[PDB]
Amino acid sequence: RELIVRPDTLRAIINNRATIETTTMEAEFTETLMESNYNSASVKVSAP
């Protein structure tokens, strides 16, 4: 619904300052874990 009566003219100002803005953000993260174990046992028994 039209709330106001159509005016004969409009009050305006001119502004043509165009702007372009681009932002890029990259993030990386890497985490490597390594573990290792070894156990050894040797036994020897003798007699004649």
Binding site: R11, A12, I13, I14, N15
Partner: protein, 38 residues
């Protein structure tokens, strides 16, 4: 190679320059910043 002189000597171009730049209108110094008046 037109200059401001060629614009000003022509009423249509002079008034286009005046209108498109709000040269007859003051500036409202609001707390949010300056804005041209209508």
């Amino acid at each position: 190679g037109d200059t401001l002189n060629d614009v000003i000597q022509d009423p249509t171009r002079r008034n286009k320059l005046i209108n498109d730049n709000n040269l007859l209108k003051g500036i409202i110094m609001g707390r949010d910043g300056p804005v041209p008046s209508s």
